Amino acid sequence: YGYTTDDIEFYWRGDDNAVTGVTKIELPQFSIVDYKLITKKVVFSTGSYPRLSLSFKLKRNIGYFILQTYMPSILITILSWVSFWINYDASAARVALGITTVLT
Amino acid sequence: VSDHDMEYTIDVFFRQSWKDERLKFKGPMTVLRLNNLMASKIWTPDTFFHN
Amino acid sequence: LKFGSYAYTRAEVVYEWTREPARSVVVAEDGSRLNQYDLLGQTVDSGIVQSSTGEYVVMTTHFHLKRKIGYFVIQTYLPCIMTVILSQVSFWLNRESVPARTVFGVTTVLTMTTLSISARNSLPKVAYATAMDWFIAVCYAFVFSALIEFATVNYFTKSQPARAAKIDRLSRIAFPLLFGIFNLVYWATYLNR
């Protein structure tokens, strides 16, 4: 914060192994794909400051979203198709099925 | 009373009184109604709530 | 509300109430933020606990609370009773309107499920059965019994009309009788408890 790039200097101790414990992280909804260490300098109206940036590329899993969200929608669409096998006489049945699939 | 946490809340004036023979005085006043920063310079009991 | 001394055993610091024990913990009159309970009184005590570091004086105070049923009546017990009555009113419809009574039974089941869901979210997540759980279970049983009775009446139609008529007239009066008996027994055992 206070010290500019001509007062302090940042770097990673090891430059590739300075950040550990990323391969052991178990996120319940994501999965760490890659991580990067970057060294640069930023310029603000008060001076130039050194900056390090630790970034983790996360990828969202799909195993939860399929069973909880995509299968209900697909089954509601199939169960809406099911009224075509109902004859054109029973109007109440096909109407109720279609509207209740809309309701689902 | 928070049933979901099995707990309750209670707002109290918690009063303690003991006798300390090192804090005897003799002045025009018979009771010194002092500040809340004098109680940190003297001994006070270390009461804690078990639950 | 147990309090005692940390770091000072019984041979160093002892506690006692400054006035009579019945008059030491004093709750104010307007001092009640309770919405669901009813403060009945207080109860103090004093004792000694044996820890790994010595014996310690512990002053105990019990506040006695009684839960008020007025919320849960309107929340759960009145909708469940009205939903079972809505299930039992199906017994008066004629046997020739099968979508009518089926929609009665199945939508009553839907109502009982949404009631049980909304009522389960009120109570904390305990791992046993409460009185409201038993009430919802018996009401669900009555609703399901009404729907299965309709299924029996409908299945026995077009083969033996007299048997279906007899069991729908008998089950038109057996369901309110059993529900009233269950209500009487349940409220008697859980209001005098």
Next chain:
Amino acid sequence: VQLQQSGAELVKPGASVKLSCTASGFNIKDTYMYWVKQRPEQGLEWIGRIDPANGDTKYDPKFQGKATITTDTFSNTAYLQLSSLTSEDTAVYYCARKGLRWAMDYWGQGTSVTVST
């Protein structure tokens, strides 16, 4: 440590009596002081108590208005004054102090009031 009471009194029914209890070995402003009565061959009866550090007094409902308990801190003494004594309160009057678990650990020596002619 020690409580000292006065001697027996023989008064006429309708007058007033004043009993004293002098404490030796402690300051009476630290505890409560109790007055108890005991009739011949019967159980104890609590008259009242006084908080000498404050002056607050409480009495038994069967003694409210009759007895009055006062204290003098400078000499460590507790006083009990009975106003209008009838022909039945010929008992022994004990002076006690509160103890550890609100018990009366130290008692006096007894003061036997007697009403006759």
Next chain:
Amino acid sequence: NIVMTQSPKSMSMSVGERVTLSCKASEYVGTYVSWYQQKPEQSPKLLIYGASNRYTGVPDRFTGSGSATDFTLTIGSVQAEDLADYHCGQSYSYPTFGAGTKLELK
């Protein structure tokens, strides 16, 4: 006014045998029941302060047992100086004593 009922009102007993005295409270008295001993024409002596705590100078044969309302006083090897009265008194509220129990020798 919490009423303490002591039982029995009068009892007889021999030497060297266990004895149990009982005190029952009308309302709740937590552990603030005390047991006093009174010889004739003497001041009462505190035996058991609180439920199950012996006073300084009391032999190890007296022991108290407490509850919310029911309290007991038990003496073990009873000697020849226990020919006296025993009172139970509550201290949860303004103090009330029991009726008394006269131990006797026979």
Next chain:
Amino acid sequence: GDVTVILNNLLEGYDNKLRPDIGVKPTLIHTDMYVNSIGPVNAINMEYTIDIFFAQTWYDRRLKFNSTIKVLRLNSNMVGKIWIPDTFFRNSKKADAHWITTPNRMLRIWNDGRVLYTLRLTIDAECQLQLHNFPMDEHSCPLEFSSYGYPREEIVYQWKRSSVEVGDTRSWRLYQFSFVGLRNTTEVVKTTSGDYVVMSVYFDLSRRMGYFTIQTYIPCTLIVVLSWVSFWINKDAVPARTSLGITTVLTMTTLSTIARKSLPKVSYVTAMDLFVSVCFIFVFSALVEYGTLHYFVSSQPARAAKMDSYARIFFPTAFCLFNLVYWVSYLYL
């Protein structure tokens, strides 16, 4: 008095920045715990609460006094004036001591220099719960601690013969779980700063199916048995059977999301979303079976006549075998 003289003589020329035997040997610290309660074990944030009285004891040859009193029993006033180890809990998300009404800490110094330091803590420790076999699962997830700055060559920890003591275990906030036992462990962990002696306490928990039962297992089976009753309706009343089936799919859909909220958004299948998935497919299967029945009654009645008589015996038996295989396979684990 004399205790003030002792305390003032102990703190003269004392440096609380240096551990005892700073260049001689590691300090041996004996640790004890007393679990007041193990709080709610919520799986959403993958954590659990615990309240303990953490006690440490070690030897400090500078706090050695000669007197006729054997032990100095002190408040938390002198905790910040002598050396205190930098114990920290490695798997804690949040942890706080207690400060009401005064800092709940205790210091006791003995005649030979043995210091005992106890404090009350409430920890929100983290343990990744492998939520397979849920809710018929058992976990054993730890509370670990070690020194923060002092490696194995400077501070060594060691349990006592009475290390971890639980209280009554019934006044604890374990709703969905049940304490079954514990075990202690010591290890050495490699860190960028050095080797640290880490001590672990594993609490073994088993989930009691008393809430998930009446929340999901009873209502889903009730909804499946409800969907079954459509076979007893005559195959001519088309709106009746369609309404029953579709209303049953509605209630099953509503019930699915409510149960799933309990646990976090894990990406694998548990034994409870598998159950509701099998129930939803079963209701769906009943409805599509009636669909094929209504389609086939016009084409050939010889095949559509015995369809309901087949379904009335095929659906309950298949469901009971599914229940048998599921409950046996998930209660054997």
Next chain:
Amino acid sequence: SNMSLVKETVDRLLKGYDIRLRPDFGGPPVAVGMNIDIASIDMVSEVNMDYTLTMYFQQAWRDKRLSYNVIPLNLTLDNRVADQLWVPDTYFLNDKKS
């Protein structure tokens, strides 16, 4: 003894130490090396647009004023001495509560 030497070393290091000035206050910049040992990543929230992570964050630099040669071991000091030494004013630009 050996503890006395360490005591006098630490007392000499902190004697006349200006916490206002960084190492080489007029000379070249000080180089600080970073290590992060990530203990956990707690909750990646999409509604709050944030993530929580626990880390062991270590900084290494060289201050010639805290140099000693009379004892052959490294000195781990009680953490309260970090308020008597110069430590860099590292901050996180994208944090919301630390």
